[PDB]
Design a protein around this motif. Structure first.
Motif, short mmCIF file in Angstrom:
data_model
loop_
_atom_site.label_atom_id
_atom_site.label_comp_id
_atom_site.label_asym_id
_atom_site.label_seq_id
_atom_site.Cartn_x
_atom_site.Cartn_y
_atom_site.Cartn_z
N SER A 1 0.83 -1.20 0.00
CA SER A 1 0.00 0.00 0.00
C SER A 1 0.86 1.25 0.00
O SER A 1 1.75 1.39 0.84
CB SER A 1 -0.92 0.02 1.23
N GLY A 2 0.59 2.17 -0.92
CA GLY A 2 1.40 3.36 -1.03
C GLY A 2 0.72 4.47 -1.80
O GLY A 2 -0.47 4.38 -2.12
N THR A 3 1.49 5.52 -2.09
CA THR A 3 1.01 6.72 -2.75
C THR A 3 1.41 6.77 -4.22
O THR A 3 2.57 6.51 -4.56
CB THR A 3 1.54 7.97 -2.04
N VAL A 4 0.45 7.09 -5.09
CA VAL A 4 0.76 7.29 -6.50
C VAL A 4 1.53 8.59 -6.65
O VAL A 4 1.07 9.65 -6.21
CB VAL A 4 -0.53 7.35 -7.32
N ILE A 5 2.71 8.53 -7.26
CA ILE A 5 3.50 9.74 -7.45
C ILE A 5 3.81 10.04 -8.91
O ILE A 5 4.42 11.08 -9.19
CB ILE A 5 4.82 9.67 -6.65
N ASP A 6 3.36 9.22 -9.85
CA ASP A 6 3.66 9.50 -11.25
C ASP A 6 2.90 8.54 -12.15
O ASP A 6 2.73 7.36 -11.82
CB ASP A 6 5.17 9.39 -11.55
N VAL A 7 2.45 9.05 -13.29
CA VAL A 7 1.80 8.25 -14.32
C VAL A 7 2.48 8.57 -15.64
O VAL A 7 2.65 9.74 -15.99
CB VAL A 7 0.29 8.54 -14.40
N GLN A 8 2.86 7.53 -16.37
CA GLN A 8 3.46 7.65 -17.68
C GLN A 8 2.52 6.97 -18.66
O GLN A 8 1.82 6.02 -18.30
CB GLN A 8 4.84 6.95 -17.71
N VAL A 9 2.43 7.48 -19.88
CA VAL A 9 1.66 6.80 -20.92
C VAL A 9 2.49 6.68 -22.19
O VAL A 9 3.00 7.68 -22.70
CB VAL A 9 0.33 7.51 -21.20
N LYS B 1 -4.44 8.89 -29.03
CA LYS B 1 -4.19 9.22 -27.65
C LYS B 1 -5.54 9.48 -26.99
O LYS B 1 -6.30 10.33 -27.47
CB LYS B 1 -3.28 10.45 -27.56
N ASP B 2 -5.85 8.77 -25.92
CA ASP B 2 -7.15 8.96 -25.27
C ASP B 2 -7.19 10.33 -24.61
O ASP B 2 -6.34 11.19 -24.84
CB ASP B 2 -7.43 7.82 -24.30
N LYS B 3 -8.19 10.54 -23.75
CA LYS B 3 -8.36 11.84 -23.11
C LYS B 3 -7.17 12.10 -22.21
O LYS B 3 -6.39 13.03 -22.45
CB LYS B 3 -9.67 11.92 -22.33
N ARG B 4 -7.03 11.30 -21.15
CA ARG B 4 -5.97 11.55 -20.17
C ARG B 4 -4.60 11.57 -20.83
O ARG B 4 -3.74 12.39 -20.46
CB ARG B 4 -6.03 10.52 -19.04
N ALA B 5 -4.36 10.71 -21.82
CA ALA B 5 -3.06 10.70 -22.48
C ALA B 5 -2.72 12.08 -23.03
O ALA B 5 -1.56 12.52 -22.96
CB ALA B 5 -3.04 9.65 -23.59
N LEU B 6 -3.72 12.81 -23.53
CA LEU B 6 -3.46 14.12 -24.14
C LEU B 6 -3.22 15.17 -23.07
O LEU B 6 -2.37 16.06 -23.24
CB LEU B 6 -4.62 14.53 -25.05
N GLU B 7 -3.95 15.08 -21.95
CA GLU B 7 -3.68 15.92 -20.79
C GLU B 7 -2.24 15.75 -20.33
O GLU B 7 -1.57 16.74 -19.98
CB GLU B 7 -4.66 15.61 -19.66
N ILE B 8 -1.74 14.52 -20.30
CA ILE B 8 -0.36 14.29 -19.88
C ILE B 8 0.59 14.92 -20.89
O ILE B 8 1.45 15.74 -20.53
CB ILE B 8 -0.09 12.79 -19.68
N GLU B 9 0.48 14.55 -22.17
CA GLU B 9 1.43 15.06 -23.14
C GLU B 9 1.31 16.57 -23.33
O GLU B 9 2.25 17.19 -23.85
CB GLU B 9 1.27 14.35 -24.49
#
Ligand SMILES: [Mg+2]
Ligand SMILES: [Zn+2]
Lengths: 1340, 50, 140, 502
Positions: free
Chosen positions: A923-931, A939-947
């Motif tokens: 159990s821990g904290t999310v600190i980063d998401v890569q796509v 590129k889906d919705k969130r993927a475009l927010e990231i890039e």
């Protein structure tokens, strides 16, 4: 004294002055690779070297030659960071210039035309990091330097155990850098043999016949001649007065009209003195002594023209008469002496089935390639290619050197292949040792073991890359048309880049960087292995090579080696060691000229060192540097004894130079048993980095060297002052002296922030300087993990007391106070990478949609509309990180499921639920998401927010650079404009951008302003391109594998505290598994009330003779004393005088040390900052063999106002009563190793089963059950446990049917088993039945 | 000697456990040998009560 | 040598033309050899007695590797002492007989002062060293 | 065909595009060694797990500390059963969700299914049948297994981070099998040699020793107390010293009748410690058995006689009491170890200068070829070999008795109460062998050859070693580790051959 030394200064005991400071520890890795990839306009090892050997390549005599011009290294496609996230190998494109020449037919050579093809591409070759690592797929790897037998010739034994005769044997081995092995060996009969490789043994003389030496020339070469004259009638003999030694008279030996010796008296010094002084040249003999002698050359009958005797044929009393009547005055014989020069080669000839050259050349061909007929062209070519082809054979330079050396030649360089002389000289020397003149080598000696490392080993992998492309190039140049093909059509890319990718990817020498620890990295990069290509095997040798050899002194560490199945097969590089030009191991020493000890240092290789007599590390010299005593303990030729004042030729550099970086970090090591010491420096590297970087209370002095030389820290490139300090970055405004003339500006160090390591530990940099602080070149700018203020802090010291605590430290188990876990100080931060893959299966594409069959909104809360978990969400077991669905249509559900779907109206989906969920228990904290998305899938919705965010962030970072760099550059323009036109107030009203116009009167300052102009416009333009490429790299389709559409990588930061089960140990090989965590209420305390942090068991110390752990605890106790003393005076605000007075007393202590100190340091602003840093305790340094001594430790206990015992009385926190007897308390630096319990703890009820064998198998990381091997079955057989055994290997594992009948029974509450037959055995029956065997089950 | 004594076992299945398997089956398959279980090793192999 | 100190013996005062075998010298050397033999026998006995206490008392598994290591050294050593006693006894027979004091390979005489140094010497300095050389050569 | 049946009895047909040869039918049976399936390992096994092991002295000998987290996943089908039996779950699918939810209701259910249900514990190299033993599981908050300290001896378990496995006896038979054959309390004797294997290990023996020991003069000397009950009262309140010579009334029993208990009361001459101790020893044993000094040797012989006179049951509960108490008094004692405990002889440096001139003697004879070269090596090696026996039995007289203390009259000396001595004499840890390396010099080492080196380690661990001395100590250490690495392989093969023929 420097700047980050002025902050906190380690009190150093130890008397011998440091004369040479520890060099860059990563020298080897960085040095070796730099040599490989670099333009060298000559042959010295490199990419150039490999090329020039195979090139020029020439077609099949077609006079179409392809030659090698030069090569280039393209810029890295991605830099270090970029290449890591994505997962490419960090490589550069290799562009090599090639020139294709054609010779006319037929030509006194010269060319019709040559096309000079520009740089063909042959793969990308990996590149080394700043810190000596490679990146292979976004994963840091290390290439371990290797140890293999040096090239050259080596004469060996195989004494004793051979044949059960004793006798011994002697063998020689010619081990070239490339090409076939040449072994020469004896046998019991004293016949000389040779074998290529480890192949079929063959009679040694066969090769002489192959070199066009006949029987006569073979005898002439290895033997002397004894000339027999027939003068008058019947036999005189030429006598060498020495030949008769080691033998007895054969008859009445007389000459010169006087009988010197009679029959039966051994010819000794008396008889040979007589002959030599009386000058006896010719003597008459009887015709019967030649009944046994062997004739040397060929003798034929002058009349009949017939063969009397063939060379190497033994004469008889009758054969002599046959060649006496034929008119032969001379008969040449062999000198045979079974003490001096043995008749070895003669007997071999009688065992040799061959006679001429082609006879042997065939016998060689049929040995190498049996089964097929020999040919004239075959036998001649094969042998010439074995040891005489520049292509298929090379000794290298090292090989030629050790070869000539062992043979007592003069040349240090010569032929690269073997000659007829080389082989004969070797065959000669082998015979000599068997004769008693000369001694044999041993494999273990570090003058016959050579070290290769990445730069060299890559050369060979490129070399093998070329030899397999060369065949291909020659093939195309056979048929090639006119001006259509060019030197690119033929040279393929994959074959070159694969032969090198093979290496860095999977190899015994390419491994994942051991990176849980700045020491772990540096101890890995300095590592040796005798395994793998060209070395020994674990199943081969063999204790001699594993054991520690005398030559390891000051080159290889004696103590840092693994403790497992390959002990002594690894070792670690010593501190001061370096690699010889030729690749041997040398170590630093000090030139003792006459009776003074100089400080001019010399590097002596393993062979060089033996000759000299080297003094000792601990030697007292004073005044000019004469040896104080008339006799000093020294070691010379492999042994150690007392020596005269002026006999020592050199002296040890340091007290440290014998150990490794790991070994040197143990304080009071001298006092620790060697066994436990190994375990100490073995476990030190397993230290997980702590939450709060401590600092060792008890140190050695090396910790600063390890921290800096390991990359984890950020070390100031150029000296200056701090302009801006951020947890992200640090900007340094450079001083004028170090600052380059043009571009001016500032050095900006961007810090590494929280990110996954190789071992899922966390690697995080923190700023260790404050705003506007003075730093000098080579200063510490930011601490890595488990480093403080520039020192290497692998753990946290604490108040430790040795005593039984109601058995909660029974074996080596450890008992820890709650005060530790409350202070979150052994809390440890881990970063795991969990990934989700959208694949393509035959049924269809997987969707990452958040529409997941049969899940409530409770899940999709932590999930955004797109289906990806939000950053920052603290999740535990079971929570979904990335919603995912795979095409699985037409389920074919059962009756009762259909009615259920119909009762509750669920839309039985045409898509399966495949989402990535959090593994149970962690159990821990999310600190980063890569796509990462396929090029061309949307590129889906969130993927475009990231890039989109990566874009906005990258511009802010880059622009921050330009903004800081402008003002930094403009600030210099302002100051040079002031030099000949200074209008302070007038200048800075107008826009700074509107400055470039202002000139200057006739001077170089006009040419200096010109310089700053140039580098301005480049920043202007270099910004643009750095922004473009960065932007393209983000949006460009991220390339993945085949079948895979898009991937989401989530990086988790779990923060694990510390609980029973974790392995912990001090630096002295004292392991222990924390057993109960006690209240501070229950801890042993003293009359001042202060509890103790850890209660260790006293029994672990006497048995395991690690006595340094006690010294450490006491010295630590005294080191905290000075802290508590300063802490009181610092809280009193006493003022500089009383404080400085007390500290000064501490840093001297008793007399004779090396430390030195103030009062130079600015008696206020600088002095006050120091006091703070000491109140936690005073860092002391115990060098390895230069350590502190009991008196100095006890003396510091007095100064701390603490008992000299190191022991106090304690009171039981529970009953409150006193503890009888004083107990020891003190401070011991302790590590928590990453055998953390909640990684080891596994459990499984029923899980996945292996397809082939229906057997519990870890598939969803619910790992396989414990394996119940052969021995555990004997356990149950010794008990009556008949059913426990049946159930164990039936229903609990192999019985596909039984397991479910059981599980169903279990919940029904009926404990029974309906066993039947294990599937493991059923497959054997089929496996057997599918061979020719009719195997049945009988009866009933 | 212990090592040789074990080599002779009535049950051929036990032998194919620790001896060289190829030789055991061939030697035993030509002979038409019948294994009655009786020993321990083999009953563990075939998964019934020791 | 502390050997002469333990006993109340002073370095032997060899006279100019002093011989080699009188009543007093052989009675003198017989006592030394007998005393020397008796001391070694007592040493061999003490060694055996110490080794049996270790064999009788059982060490704990952890200190077994250290006890086992130390037990093997004594044993090797013990067997070495027993060989020496047989060598002195052999030398005691050379005194009683008439073949003591000369090199066994060549008839050369071994030095008088050399024999007082190593009464077990079988060879002269020249012959002994060559044997060690062949040894290192015939072995390794 | 031949490559299909047993490839390798030809030229070794290789597999497609892959250099490696392809595995045939015969090679699917053959292996290393024999049938893989019956070879270790050995078939993986459901209902199992493992983790690091720790201590837990609070255990009774028939139980063990098992993590909550493990037991939940392990007994999952059992919990699913008992949950719907008592009606707490509508259906199994609900039960799955219940234990997945980790609802607090389940813990109370788990404790039902856990009670009389043994589990099997197994530690790394399973050497004798005592390598697997059955315990009754006790739920633990934490992720480590808790192992009753007395079995640590049998397992050759230390706590250097070793892990153990668990196994659940599923069937009714396996439960009754694990309880009557594999249970802790049924196997307290080694099957190799009738002596107790559940002997007190180390910490626990150091306890009783310090307890049943006497010093010349301390609080409580010579007074008299009604019995052990009031002997304990005297110590806990600080009126008497644990070790003071004292007459107390005791009542021992002796079954010398025909299996019948006879009582004897007597005024025994003892100490306070031995007085307190008798309160444990059950009935029919004689007070003589606890009247001595109690070292590791005598402490186990005591447990043994209890077995052969009273039977299994009383010995078990007896052995528990010994452990609880032995640990306790070790803590009260405040026994420890500091630098000043390792007393070097005052005469050491003297001993050196004598043997240093003796080596200087054998050198003088060697000089310019007097005496031969090889002689000198073995001459010196002898004069060194003696001194170590001198230094050893020098310190051992000083270390042993030199606590010189007085009783009312003049002066007296007794066995030392120095920390490090008590450990070896009792047998708790360390041996006169090991002490010889802490205080006296540590022997001579031998080069890789085996040929012991002509300049011993003259320093000890309380002193420093220097450059060369450590470097010499190296060989023996590495070969030591190397050896015991091989002594694992040799045992394994030897035991393997032996069971195959038995
Ligand atoms: Mg262990
Ligand atoms: Zn001689």
């Amino acid at each position: 004294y420097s700047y980050t030394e002025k902050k906190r200064i380690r009190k150093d005991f130890g008397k011998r002055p440091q004369v040479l400071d520890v060099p860059y520890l990563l020298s080897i890795q960085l040095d070796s690779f730099q040599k490989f990839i670099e333009q060298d306009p000559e042959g010295q090892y490199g990419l150039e070297a490999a090329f020039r050997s195979v090139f020029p390549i020439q077609s099949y005599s077609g006079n179409s030659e392809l030659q090698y011009v030069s090569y280039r290294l393209g810029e890295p496609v991605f830099d270090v960071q970029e290449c890591q996230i994505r997962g490419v190998t960090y490589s550069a494109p290799l562009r090599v210039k090639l020139r294709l020449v054609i010779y006319e037919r037929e030509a006194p050579e010269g060319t019709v035309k040559d096309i000079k093809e520009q740089e063909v591409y042959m793969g990308e070759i990996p590149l080394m990091t700043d810190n000596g690592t490679f990146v292979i797929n976004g994963t840091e790897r290390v290439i371990v330097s290797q140890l293999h037998r040096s090239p050259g010739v080596f004469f060996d034994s195989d004494k004793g155990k051979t044949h059960s005769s004793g006798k011994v044997l002697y063998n020689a081995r010619i081990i070239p850098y490339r090409g076939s092995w040449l072994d020469f060996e004896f046998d019991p009969k004293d016949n000389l043999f040779v074998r290529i490789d480890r192949r079929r043994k063959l009679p040694a003389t066969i090769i002489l016949r192959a070199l066009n030496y006949t029987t006569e020339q073979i005898l002439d070469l290895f033997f002397e001649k004894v000339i027999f004259e027939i003068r008058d009638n019947k036999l005189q003999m030429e006598l060498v007065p020495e030949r008769l030694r080691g033998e007895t008279a054969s008859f009445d030996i007389e000459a010169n009209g006087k009988v010197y010796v009679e029959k039966g008296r051994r010819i000794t010094a008396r008889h040979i003195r007589q002959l030599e002084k009386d000058d006896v040249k010719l003597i008459e003999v009887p015709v019967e002594y030649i009944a046994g002698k062997v004739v040397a050359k060929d003798y034929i009958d002058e009349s009949t023209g017939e063969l009397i005797c063939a060379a190497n044929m033994e004469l008889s009393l009758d054969l002599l008469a046959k060649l006496s009547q034929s008119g032969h005055k001379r008969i040449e014989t062999l000198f045979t002496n079974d003490l001096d020069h043995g008749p070895y080669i003669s007997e071999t000839l009688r065992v040799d089935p061959t006679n001429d050259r082609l006879s042997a050349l065939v016998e060689i061909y049929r040995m190498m390639r049996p089964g097929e007929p020999p040919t004239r062209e075959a036998a001649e070519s094969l042998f010439e290619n074995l040891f005489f082809s520049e292509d298929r054979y090379d000794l290298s330079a090292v090989g030629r050197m050790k070869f000539n050396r062992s043979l007592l030649r003069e040349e240090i360089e010569g032929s690269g292949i073997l000659s007829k002389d080389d082989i004969i000289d070797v065959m000669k020397k082998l015979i000599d040792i068997r004769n008693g003149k000369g001694e044999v080598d041993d494999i273990d000696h570090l003058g016959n073991r050579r070290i290769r490392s990445v730069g060299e080993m890559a050369e060979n992998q490129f070399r093998v890359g070329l030899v397999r492309v060369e065949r291909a190039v020659k093939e195309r140049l056979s048929l090639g048309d006119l001006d259509t093909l060019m030197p690119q059509d033929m040279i393929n890319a994959k074959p070159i880049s694969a032969a090198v990718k093979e290496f860095f990817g999977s190899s015994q020498l390419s491994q994942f960087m051991d990176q849980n620890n700045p020491l772990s990295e540096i101890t890995h990069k300095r590592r040796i292995s005798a395994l793998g290509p060209g070395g020994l095997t674990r199943e081969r040798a063999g204790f001699e090579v594993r054991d520690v050899h005398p030559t390891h002194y000051g080159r290889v560490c004696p103590i840092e080696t693994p403790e497992g199945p390959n002990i002594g097969l690894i070792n670690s590089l010593s501190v001061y060691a370096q690699t010889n030009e030729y690749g041997f191991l040398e170590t630093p020493y000090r030139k003792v000229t006459d009776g003074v000890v100089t400080d001019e240092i010399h590097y002596l290789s393993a062979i060089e060192e033996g000759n000299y007599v080297i003094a000792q590390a601990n030697s007292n010299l004073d005044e000019e540097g004469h040896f104080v005593e008339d006799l000093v303990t020294c070691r010379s030729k492999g042994e150690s004894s007392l020596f005269s004042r002026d006999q020592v030729d050199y002296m040890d550099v340091s007290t440290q130079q014998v150990v490794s970086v790991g070994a040197s970090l143990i304080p009071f090591l001298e006092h620790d048993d060697a066994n436990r010491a190994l375990m100490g420096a073995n476990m030190q590297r397993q230290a997980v980095p702590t939450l709060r970087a401590d600092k060792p209370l008890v140190g050695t002095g090396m910790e600063r060297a390890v921290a800096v030389d390991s990359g984890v820290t950020a070390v100031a490139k150029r000296g200056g002052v701090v302009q801006y300090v951020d947890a992200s970055r640090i900007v340094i405004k450079v001083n004028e002296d170090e600052m380059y003339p043009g571009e001016a500006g500032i050095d900006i160090y961007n810090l590494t922030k929280y990110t996954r390591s190789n071992q899922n530990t966390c690697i995080n940099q923190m700023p260790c300087v404050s705003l506007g602080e003075p730093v000098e070149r080579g200063d510490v700018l930011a601490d890595g993990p488990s480093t403080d203020l520039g020192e290497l802090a692998l753990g946290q010291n604490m108040r430790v007391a040795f005593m039984p605590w109601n058995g909660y430290n029974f074996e080596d188990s450890i008992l820890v106070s709650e005060r530790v876990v409350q202070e979150d100080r052994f809390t440890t931060i881990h970063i795991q990478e969990l990934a989700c893959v959208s694949r393509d299966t035959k049924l269809g594409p997987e969707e990452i949609t958040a529409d997941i069959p049969n899940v409530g909104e409770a899940a999709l809360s932590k999930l955004d509309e797109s289906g990806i978990v939000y950053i920052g969400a603290e999740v535990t077991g079971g929570d979904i990180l990335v919603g995912k669905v795979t095409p699985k249509g037409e389920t074919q559900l059962t009756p009762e499921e259909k009615l259920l779907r119909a009762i509750f109206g669920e839309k039985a989906s045409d898509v399966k639920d495949s989402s990535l969920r959090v593994p149970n228990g962690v159990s821990g904290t999310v600190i980063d998401v890569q796509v990462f998305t396929r090029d061309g899938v949307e590129k889906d919705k969130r993927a475009l927010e990231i890039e989109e965010m990566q874009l906005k962030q990258a511009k802010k970072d880059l622009s921050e650079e330009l903004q800081i760099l402008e003002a930094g550059l403009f600030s210099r323009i302002r100051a040079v404009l002031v030099a000949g036109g200074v209008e302070a107030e007038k200048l800075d009203k107008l826009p700074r951008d509107r400055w470039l116009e202002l000139g200057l009167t006739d001077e170089e300052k006009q040419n200096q302003l010109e310089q700053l102009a140039e580098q301005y416009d480049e920043l202007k333009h270099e910004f643009e391109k750095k922004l473009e490429a960065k932007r393209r790299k983000i949006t460009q389709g991220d390339d993945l594998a085949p079948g895979v559409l898009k991937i989401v990588k989530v990086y988790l930061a779990v923060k694990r505290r510390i609980q029973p089960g974790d392995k912990m140990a001090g630096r002295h090989g004292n392991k222990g598994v924390i057993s109960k965590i006690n209240p501070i209420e229950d801890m042993p305390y003293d009359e001042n009330g202060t509890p103790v942090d850890i209660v260790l068991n006293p029994l672990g110390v006497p048995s395991r003779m690690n006595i340094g752990q006690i010294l450490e605890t006491h010295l630590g106790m005294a080191a905290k004393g000075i802290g508590d003393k300063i802490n009181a005076m610092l809280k009193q605000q006493q003022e500089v005088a009383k404080l400085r007075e007390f500290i000064q007393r501490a840093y001297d202590l008793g007399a004779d040390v090396r430390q030195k100190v103030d009062l130079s340091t600015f008696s206020d602003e600088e002095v006050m900052r120091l006091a703070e840093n000491l109140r936690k305790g005073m860092p002391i340094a115990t060098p390895v063999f230069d350590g502190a001594k009991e008196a100095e430790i006890k003396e510091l206990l007095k100064l701390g106002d603490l008992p000299t015992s190191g022991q106090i009385r304690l009171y039981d926190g529970r009953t409150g009563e006193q503890f009888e007897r004083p107990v020891t308390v003190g401070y011991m630096y302790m590590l928590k190793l990453n055998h953390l319990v909640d990684d080891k703890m596994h459990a499984r009820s029923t899980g996945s089963y292996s397809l082939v064998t229906q057997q519990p198998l870890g598939g969803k990381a619910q790992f396989g059950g414990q394996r119940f091997g052969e021995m555990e079955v004997w356990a149950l057989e010794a008990y009556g446990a008949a059913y426990t055994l049946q159930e164990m290997l039936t229903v609990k594992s192999d019985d596909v049917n039984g397991r479910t009948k059981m599980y169903k029974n279990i919940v029904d509450g009926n404990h029974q088993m309906e066993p039947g037959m294990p599937e493991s055995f059923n497959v054997l029956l089929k496996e057997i039945r599918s061979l020719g065997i009719n195997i049945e089950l009988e009866d009933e | 000697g212990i090592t040789k004594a074990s080599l002779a076992t009535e049950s051929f299945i036990s032998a194919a456990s620790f001896q060289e398997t190829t030789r055991v089956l061939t030697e035993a398959a030509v002979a038409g040998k019948r294994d009655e279980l009786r020993g321990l090793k083999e009953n563990v192999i075939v998964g019934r009560l020791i | 040598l502390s050997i002469l100190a333990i006993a109340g013996v002073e370095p032997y005062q060899e006279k100019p033309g002093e011989e080699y075998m009188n009543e007093a010298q052989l009675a003198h050397f017989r006592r030394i050899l007998e005393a020397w033999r008796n001391q070694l026998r007592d040493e061999v006995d003490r060694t055996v007695t110490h080794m049996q206490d270790e064999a009788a008392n059982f060490p704990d598994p952890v200190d077994r590797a250290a006890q086992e290591e130390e037990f093997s050294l004594e044993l090797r050593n013990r067997d070495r002492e027993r060989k020496l006693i047989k060598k002195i006894e052999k030398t005691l027979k050379k005194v009683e007989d008439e073949d003591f004091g000369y090199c066994e390979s060549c008839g050369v005489e071994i030095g008088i002062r050399r024999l007082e140094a190593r009464p077990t010497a079988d060879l002269c300095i020249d012959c002994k060293t060559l044997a060690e050389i062949r040894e290192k050569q015939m072995a390794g | 065909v031949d490559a299909l049946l047993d490839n390798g009895r030809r030229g070794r047909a290789i597999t497609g595009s892959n250099k490696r040869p392809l595995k045939s039918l015969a090679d699917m049976i053959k292996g290393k060694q024999g049938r893989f399936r019956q070879n270790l390992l050995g078939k993986r096994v459901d209902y199992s797990g493992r983790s690091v092991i720790t201590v837990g002295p609070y255990l009774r000998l028939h139980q063990c500390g098992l993590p909550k987290k493990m037991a939940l996943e392990l007994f999952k089908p059992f919990i699913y059963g008992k949950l719907e039996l008592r009606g707490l779950a509508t259906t199994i699918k609900a039960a799955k969700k219940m234990v997945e939810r980790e609802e607090a209701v389940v813990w109370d259910i788990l404790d039902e299914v856990i009670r009389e249900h043994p589990v099997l514990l197994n530690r790394a190299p399973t050497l004798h049948r005592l390598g697997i033993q059955a315990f009754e599981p006790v739920l633990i908050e934490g992720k480590a297994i808790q192992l009753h300290p007395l079995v640590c001896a049998a397992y050759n378990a230390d706590f250097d981070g070793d892990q153990m496995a668990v196994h659940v006896p599923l069937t009714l038979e396996a439960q009754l099998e694990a309880r009557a054959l594999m249970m802790s309390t049924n196997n307290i004797l080694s099957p190799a040699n009738g002596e107790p294997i559940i002997v007190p290990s180390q910490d626990v023996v150091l306890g009783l020793y310090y307890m049943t020991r006497d010093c010349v003069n301390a609080k409580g000397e010579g007074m008299v107390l009604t019995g052990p009950k009031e002997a304990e009262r005297l110590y806990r309140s600080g009126l008497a010293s644990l070790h003071a010579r004292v007459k107390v009334r005791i009542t021992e029993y002796e079954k010398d009748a025909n299996g019948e208990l006879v009582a004897k009361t007597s005024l025994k001459d003892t100490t306070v410690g031995r007085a307190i101790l008798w309160m444990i020893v059950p009935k029919g044993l004689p007070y003589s058995i606890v009247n001595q000094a109690l070292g590791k040797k005598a402490i186990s012989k005591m447990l043994n006689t209890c077995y052969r006179i009273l039977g299994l049951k009383p010995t078990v509960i007896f052995a528990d009491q010994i452990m609880y108490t032995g640990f306790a008094y070790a803590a009260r004692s405040g026994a420890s170890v500091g630098i000043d405990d390792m007393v070097i002889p005052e005469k050491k440096h003297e001993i050196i200068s004598e043997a240093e001139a003796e080596v200087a003697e054998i050198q003088e004879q060697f000089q310019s070829g007097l005496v031969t070269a090889g002689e000198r090596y073995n001459k010196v090696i002898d004069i060194w070999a003696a001194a170590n026996d001198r230094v050893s039995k020098a310190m051992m007289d000083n270390l042993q008795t030199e606590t010189v203390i007085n009783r009312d009259g003049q002066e007296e000396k007794q066995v030392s109460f120095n920390s490090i001595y008590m450990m070896a004499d009792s047998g708790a840890r360390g041996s006169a062998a090991q002490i010889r390396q802490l205080a006296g010099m540590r022997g001579l080492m031998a080069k890789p050859d085996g040929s012991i080196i002509e300049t011993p380690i003259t320093a000890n661990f309380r002193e420093g070693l220097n450059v060369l001395q450590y470097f010499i100590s190296t060989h023996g250490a590495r070969k030591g580790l190397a050896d015991t690495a091989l002594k694992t392989a040799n045992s394994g093969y030897l035991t393997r051959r032996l069971v195959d023929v038995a």
